[PDB]
């Protein structure tokens, strides 16, 4: 008999465990939750959380973007809880020393040839338990087909949301609403 809001008992919104049945990812988390709990460094606490993320937050960073975040800071190990893709536009790949979950086989060839080390996360623990002189990165989350559609809903004044439309070009959602000559602009 308490005047309490929800008598909370209030839950936490973020994910509380690993969802994968991938056994290697589970053992990765067991490492980095021993290492988070015991070591005290905030690097390991963040890496633990980012390991448990779903696929759309483990988004691929290109080799050419990974150059330019790591530009002034050449010595430091470039961590990315995520995948690493080759940039085809990048002609001469810079050497770096990357850690990540997964390299595509082009990007593994391109770094290793260019004089450039290519680590897993369990190897990063042996070198750098604290995360001393590392660079956390992550690929942009809101940069995909699906996330163009979100926001204020396309027929409202000054939204930049895409409509869900079956096909492109005229004859599809380009008349009443989109022209002033057809009723109204909005």
């Amino acid at each position: 008999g308490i005047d309490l809001e929800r008598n909370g008992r209030k839950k936490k919104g973020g994910r509380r465990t690993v969802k994968s049945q991938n056994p290697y990812l589970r053992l990765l988390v067991k490492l980095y939750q021993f290492l988070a709990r015991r070591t005290n460094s905030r690097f390991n606490a963040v890496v633990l959380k980012r390991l448990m993320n779903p696929k759309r937050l483990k988004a691929p960073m290109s080799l050419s973007k990974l150059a330019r975040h790591m530009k002034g800071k050449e010595d430091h190990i470039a961590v990315l809880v995520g995948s690493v893709t080759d940039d085809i536009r990048m002609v001469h790949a810079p050497k770096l020393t990357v850690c990540a979950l997964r390299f595509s086989e082009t990007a593994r060839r391109r770094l290793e040839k260019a004089g450039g080390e290519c680590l897993t996360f369990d190897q990063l623990a042996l070198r750098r338990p604290k995360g001393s002189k590392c660079v956390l990165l992550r690929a942009a989350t809101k940069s995909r087909e699906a996330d163009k559609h979100f926001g204020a809903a396309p027929g409202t004044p000054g939204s930049k949301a895409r409509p869900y439309v079956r096909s492109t070009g005229r004859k599809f959602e380009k008349a009443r609403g989109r022209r002033k000559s057809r009723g109204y602009k909005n």
């Binding site: 559609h149 809903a153 869900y164 439309v165 079956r166």
Partner: peptide, 9 residues
């Protein structure tokens, strides 16, 4: 027709 989906075809 409800919500934001594609108009069905």
């Amino acid at each position: 027709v409800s919500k934001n989906n594609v108009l069905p075809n």
